[PDB]
């Protein structure tokens, strides 16, 4: 019973959750109303996989998900939509205003009186579970709710549960495009919590996804639905290892064991290789070598950062479909001989490999082609520091003049907190610069006693 509890916070979290649960319902043969006709037609089976869905006596399947927001709008769209009968009616939406792009409003002022209900329902979901594996928290940097309330929730969860893994998928602010004037303050404030209380944070950038959609899928005018569907595919690839059989299965603990060298370096990038349109699915083989090479192309990264400017510290490749080990070994050997891809000298092995038999599914009305093979790569590297440094600069440009600060102090913060967060960020950045350095020449300086 490899069970996982999903938590969606804020507008971005709820919409990514809509995409994710559409994909999960289609993978398992579950209808929008919760019934599964496959078991009725066959007579019984394991298709009600306990990773995501809980089965009642009548044959209905209720997801193991928790949606939270301070705006009634985003979740009232779900209560009256296609999937109104799938979710439990209890959706934890405060009938009040929103955090208003304010960390303080969502952490100190209004995040209270909704936190207790959220933890009570999370407790109820965790009591139903046997062998709970971890949490998957979806939220967004730069928002009020998605930053502050996620901070509070993560703190309380780390207090209560403690040992369970807590993975985090989040939308980092982009370098150029933005949807708010006070994004840097919220991001720098919530880094201080996501550094301590999470176990592994996967960051995605909307500019990168727009570029991938433009170049690969030939979509000139994408919306958030396409980005959410791509993120859903990635999360499904991560979690497939504990839902279907495979040659090599990689659980959620092996993730953290292999990709996290030190406790403060748990910020890997994520990429998905066979992102291609139906028309271009032809004229292409889509072999293991091609997709493994495409994972390492800088253009296909989901965060606007160049891996060639840093060094790879760990890689985890999760394959789906008609894949066999020998091609994976050949592809890894080919990648190890390229000079543009540099690994830190203190990690000779480098690669973790997992294989699953279930091929990826196609969502009707989607834009990804039907393929026989796929790979999701997760790479813990040092280039991510660049993605932070830009943000730091932006923060400084506003904090020298204390712009937009009185909104934060009016909601229960003091000024010094800002400085504290900034200092923490510098320390984290410094750590990356210390771990990518090559070991000192002949690490024991030199040696050579008698004989």
């Amino acid at each position: 019973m490899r069970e996982c509890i999903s938590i969606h916070v804020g507008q971005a979290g709820v919409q990514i959750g809509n995409a994710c649960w559409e994909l999960y319902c289609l993978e398992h043969g579950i209808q929008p109303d919760g019934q599964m006709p496959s078991d009725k037609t066959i007579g019984g089976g394991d298709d009600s996989f306990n990773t995501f869905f809980s089965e009642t006596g009548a044959g209905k399947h209720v997801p193991r998900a928790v949606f939270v927001d301070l705006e009634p709008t985003v979740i009232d769209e779900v209560r009256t939509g296609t999937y109104r009968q799938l979710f439990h009616p209890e959706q934890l939406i405060t009938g009040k205003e929103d955090a208003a792009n304010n960390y303080a409003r969502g952490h100190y002022t209004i995040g209270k009186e909704i936190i207790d209900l959220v933890l009570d329902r999370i407790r109820k979901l965790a009591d139903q579970c046997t062998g709970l594996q971890g949490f998957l928290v979806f939220h967004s940097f730069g928002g009020g709710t998605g930053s502050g309330f996620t901070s509070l929730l993560m703190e309380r969860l780390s207090v209560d549960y403690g040992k369970k893994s807590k993975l985090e998928f989040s939308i980092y602010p982009a370098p150029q495009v933005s949807t708010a004037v006070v994004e840097p303050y919220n991001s720098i404030l919530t880094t201080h919590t996501t550094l301590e209380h999470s176990d592994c944070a996967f960051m995605v950038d909307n500019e990168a996804i727009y570029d991938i959609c433009r170049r690969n899928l030939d979509i000139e005018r994408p919306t958030y639905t396409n980005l959410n569907r791509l993120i859903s595919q990635i999360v499904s690839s991560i979690t497939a290892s504990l839902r279907f059989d495979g040659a090599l299965n990689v659980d959620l603990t092996e993730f953290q064991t292999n990709l996290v060298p030190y406790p403060r370096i748990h910020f890997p990038l994520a990429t998905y290789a066979p992102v291609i349109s139906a028309e271009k699915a032809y004229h292409e083989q889509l072999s293991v070598a091609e997709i493994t090479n495409a994972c390492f192309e800088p253009a296909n990264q989901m965060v606007k950062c160049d891996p060639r400017h840093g060094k790879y510290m760990a890689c985890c490749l999760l394959y789906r479909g008609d894949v066999v080990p020998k091609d994976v070994n050949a592809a890894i050997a080919t990648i190890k001989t390229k000079r543009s891809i540099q690994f830190v000298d203190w990690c000779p092995t480098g690669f973790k490999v997992g294989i699953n038999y279930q091929p990826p599914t196609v969502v009707p009305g989607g834009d990804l082609a039907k393929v026989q093979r796929a790979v999701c790569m997760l790479s813990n590297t040092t280039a991510i520091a660049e993605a932070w440094a830009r943000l730091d600069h932006k923060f400084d440009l506003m904090y020298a003049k204390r712009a937009f600060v009185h909104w934060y102090v009016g909601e229960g913060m003091e000024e010094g907190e800002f400085s504290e967060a900034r200092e923490d960020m510098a320390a984290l950045e410094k750590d990356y610069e210390e771990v990518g350095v090559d070991s000192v020449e002949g690490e024991g300086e030199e040696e050579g006693e008698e004989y």
Binding site: N249, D251, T257, L259, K326, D345, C347, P348, T349, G350
Partner: protein, 432 residues
């Protein structure tokens, strides 16, 4: 009557064990339901080496399947020979080791080891005259390495006079599948060098090379590697089950292969291997088997014997053949390759012959070498180990489970001393 208890740990161990039981059941003519449907009368004469009898004239293998992740167990039950095993021997828990040797050895395995030892005691107390144990596991993993080492230690504490065999898949230089293989391999070898009588080294690189180069397969999967390994396991213990012109028990191999207690890491091999389309050209006979036996590309450990010397070797033949030809061929192999054998062991080749070949072959043979070239493999792991222990690359996962740097340092020192001990006899001179 000599009888063996079989233990399986982890994914690799479970899958190799399943294929091995398929092969053995085929050899003795056992139906997947457990009934006997053979032809020769000598199949049942020594069935009790591996199988217990059951009331409906059925036969149940004396196997113990162990893991910390339930899924692998299911893959064994939902298979061609899933129903043959008795369900009481499927011992497992939850919250698998997660590729962490500490979790397998100290934290998680410490709870399930009692149940596994209870089943081991139950199987061993019914034995007429227990010969030894054999364990299949992977050194480069989690639950396999840790719980195999823990079980080995406990059993050697409980049964000191018995034989402890071990078929281990250890990390390869090129083919890497997990990031922390060196840590697990080093600690596992530190345990094995103390608490084991024989250890057969198996490498995925060598098996892939055999499949590509000798068998000419285009898409080799893990089934074929399990096939080769299981053939080797059957070849090792052939002589306990069938008559022959010159028998060879496990103890005979141990005595004739191990000159000093710490040098018991063996390079296995099998012959013939013909690729399904060249067999019509090659004539099968003892010289051809011997030629393929000592060839470098046929070894299963990915260590070239030409880079060292053979402390000892053992050859077990199966089939009707002349002893004069066998002895002459082994003698010729010694004299012609005079530089790859030590000079302080006269006649360092052991010979055994069994009358009954495999089902589909007129002749067969297996090879168990003991050479200094194996040191290369250990050196490799040690190098990688240092590269990750100088900076403490992943040490917090292991130290959170109740370990310290002391254990890492002592394991590294023990491995280096083993490497030096093998290197002592590698170079020539020495003499008389």
């Amino acid at each position: 009557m000599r009888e063996i208890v079989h233990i399986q740990a982890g994914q690799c161990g479970n899958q190799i064990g399943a294929k091995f039981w398929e092969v053995i059941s085929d050899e003795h003519g056992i139906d997947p339901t457990g009934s006997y449907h053979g032809d020769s009368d000598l199949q049942l004469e020594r069935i009790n080496v591996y199988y217990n009898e059951a009331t409906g004239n059925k036969y149940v293998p004396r196997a113990i399947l162990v893991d910390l992740e339930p899924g692998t167990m299911d893959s064994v039950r939902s298979g061609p020979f899933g129903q043959i095993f008795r369900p009481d021997n499927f011992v497992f828990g939850q919250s698998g080791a997660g590729n962490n040797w500490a979790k397998g050895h100290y934290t998680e395995g410490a709870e399930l080891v009692d149940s596994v030892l209870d089943v081991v005691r139950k199987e061993s107390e019914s034995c007429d005259c227990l010969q030894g144990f054999q364990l299949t596991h992977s050194l480069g993993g989690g639950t396999g390495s840790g719980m195999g080492t823990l079980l080995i230690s406990k059993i050697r504490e409980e049964y000191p006079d018995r034989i402890m065999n071990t078929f281990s898949v250890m990390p390869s230089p090129k083919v890497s599948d997990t990031v922390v293989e060196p840590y697990n391999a080093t600690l596992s070898v530190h345990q094995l060098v103390e608490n084991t009588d024989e250890t057969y080294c198996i490498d995925n690189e060598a098996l892939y090379d055999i499949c590509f180069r000798t068998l000419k397969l285009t898409t080799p999967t893990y089934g074929d590697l399990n096939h080769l390994v299981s053939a080797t396991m059957s070849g090792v213990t052939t002589c306990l089950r069938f008559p022959g012109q010159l028998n060879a028990d496990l103890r005979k191999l141990a005595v004739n292969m191990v000159p000093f207690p710490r040098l018991h890491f063996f390079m296995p091999g099998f012959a013939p291997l013909t690729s399904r389309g060249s067999q019509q050209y090659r004539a099968l006979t003892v010289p051809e088997l011997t030629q393929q036996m000592f060839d470098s590309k046929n070894m299963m450990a990915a260590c070239d014997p030409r880079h060292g010397r053979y402390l000892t070797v053992a050859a077990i033949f199966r089939g009707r053949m002349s002893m004069k030809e066998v002895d002459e061929q082994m003698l010729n192999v010694q004299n012609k390759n005079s530089s790859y054998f030590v000079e302080w062991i006269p006649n360092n080749v052991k010979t055994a012959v069994c009358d009954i070949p495999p089902r589909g072959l007129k002749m067969s043979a297996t090879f168990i070498g003991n050479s200094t070239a194996i040191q290369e493999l250990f050196k490799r792991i040690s190098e990688q180990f240092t590269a990750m222990f100088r900076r403490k690359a992943f040490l917090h996962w292991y130290t959170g489970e109740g370990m310290d740097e002391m254990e890492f340092t002592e394991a590294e020192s023990n491995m280096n001393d083993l490497v030096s001990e093998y290197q002592q006899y590698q170079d020539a001179t020495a003499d008389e």
